[PDB]
Amino acid sequence: VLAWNTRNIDATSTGNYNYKYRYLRHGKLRPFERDISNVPFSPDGKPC
Amino acid sequence: KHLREFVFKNKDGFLYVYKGYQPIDVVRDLPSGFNTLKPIFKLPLGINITNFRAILTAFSTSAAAYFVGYLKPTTFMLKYDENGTIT
Amino acid sequence: VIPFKDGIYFAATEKSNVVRGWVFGSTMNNKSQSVIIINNSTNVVIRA
Ligand SMILES: *[C@@H]1O[C@H](CO)[C@@H](O[C@@H]2O[C@H](CO)[C@@H](O[C@@H]3O[C@H](CO)[C@@H](O)[C@H](O)[C@@H]3O)[C@H](O)[C@H]2NC(C)=O)[C@H](O)[C@H]1NC(C)=O
Ligand SMILES: *[C@@H]1O[C@H](CO)[C@@H](O[C@@H]2O[C@H](CO)[C@@H](O[C@@H]3O[C@H](CO)[C@@H](O)[C@H](O)[C@@H]3O)[C@H](O)[C@H]2NC(C)=O)[C@H](O)[C@H]1NC(C)=O
Ligand SMILES: *[C@@H]1O[C@H](CO)[C@@H](O[C@@H]2O[C@H](CO)[C@@H](O[C@@H]3O[C@H](CO)[C@@H](O)[C@H](O)[C@@H]3O)[C@H](O)[C@H]2NC(C)=O)[C@H](O)[C@H]1NC(C)=O
Ligand SMILES: *[C@@H]1O[C@H](CO)[C@@H](O[C@@H]2O[C@H](CO)[C@@H](O[C@@H]3O[C@H](CO)[C@@H](O)[C@H](O)[C@@H]3O)[C@H](O)[C@H]2NC(C)=O)[C@H](O)[C@H]1NC(C)=O
């Protein structure tokens, strides 16, 4: 696992908001899973 | 004339595929016997599989058939012959 | 549509090569990634 700082590359003075993360899902992901779906989330599985 | 066999498993982001076949003379049933399949693919797809569909051929018209079963975490003993073939 | 249930066995009896391939996925539509595996009689082609 390798990582480095990119403050002078990716970050911007106005805020670089071109990167996203997931925080809501009906259960956790499996190892090495690319869940890249993007629909409205509902706390009890309903359409919204 | 021929029976084709495949095994599909989705594990650690990889789709595993095994293949094998034999000559047949059956019309409607599923021939009994013993045959060991070999690995052919290991695809780093990283995708979520819960369903699948078969892709058929259109004619304009003989009959054809296929079969689906399900796999389980089951313990097996395998008998290897002198040449390393499972019999 | 047939459930995958974390692993399947598939077989087919042929005299005219009717079954050519399979599609594997979740919701089985363009709202998510899925893989198409086909024997197109000249090449075996796999795409996700
Ligand atoms: C692959 O994507 C499919 C998208 O449909 C996921 O299927 C859904 O998985 C959940 C979790 O097992 C299934 O059960 C649901 O659990 C929530 C938990 O609170 C519950 O509220 C729901 O009522 C339901 O029980 C859900 O039924 C299932 N949907 C379908 C159509 O089968 C699938 O889990 C994804 N695979 C992986 C490995 O994440
Ligand atoms: C696994 O090993 C056994 C060892 O006995 C193999 O059985 C024998 O394999 C040979 C080679 O095909 C068979 O044919 C023989 O070829 C020689 C070549 O000069 C010939 O002189 C003999 O008269 C005979 O034709 C032999 O019949 C066969 N023995 C028996 C009892 O079947 C076996 O084939 C090996 N398995 C594989 C998949 O190679
Ligand atoms: C997956 O592919 C299907 C193909 O049918 C997509 O469904 C179609 O989506 C369009 C919107 O992009 C729907 O509206 C259409 O808009 C055009 C714009 O000029 C209009 O000319 C059409 O008459 C229609 O209004 C279209 O009705 C819809 N088709 C169906 C059967 O629902 C679907 O959105 C695709 N999914 C993804 C994730 O791209
Ligand atoms: C069955 O699968 C084969 C293999 O993909 C298909 O034939 C292939 O078709 C492509 C384009 O139609 C042929 O040209 C290729 O284009 C790409 C574009 O970037 C290029 O990078 C390749 O170097 C090549 O130029 C390709 O040569 C051709 N291959 C063969 C063996 O025919 C075939 O069309 C498929 N059959 C059907 C009904 O789709």
Q: Is there a contact between A42 and A26 (Cβ–Cβ < 8 Å)? A: no
Q: Give dist(CA A40, CA B10) in Å, integer.
A: 27
Q: Best interface-test mutation with B: which of C2, C5, C9, C28 has the largest number of B CBs within 10 A?
A: C9
Closest CA to B70 of C27, C3, C14: C3
Contacts of C31 in chain A (CB under 8 A): 37, 39
Tokens of B78: 């395998």
Closest CA to B41 of B18, B25, B62, B59: B18
Tokens of B67: 């079969």
Contact residues for B59 (Cβ-Cβ < 8 A; gap 6+) = C16
Output Rg (C-alpha) for chain C, integer angstroms.
12
Which residue type occupies C2?
A: I
Q: Give dist(CA B7, CA B60) in Å, integer.
A: 31
Distances (CA, A) of B64 to B21, B28, C16, C21: 16, 9, 8, 14
Exposed, middle or buried: residue C37 (CB in 10 Å: 0-12, 13-18, 19+)?
A: buried
- Residue B48 and residue A31: Cβ atoms within 8 Å? no
Contacts of C19 in chain B (CB under 8 A): 4, 54-57, 64, 66
Q: Is there a contact between B8 and B37 (Cβ–Cβ < 8 Å)? A: no
Q: Give dist(CA C16, CA C18) in Å, integer.
A: 6
Q: Give dist(CA B7, CA B11) in Å, integer.
A: 13
Contact residues for A18 (Cβ-Cβ < 8 A; gap 6+) = none
Q: Please tell me what resolution, in angstroms, this structure has.
A: 4.2
Q: Give dist(CA B3, CA C11) in Å, integer.
A: 7
Tokens of C32: 């998510």
Sign of CA dihedral C3, C6, C12, C18: positive
Sign of CA dihedral B12, C5, C39, B31: positive
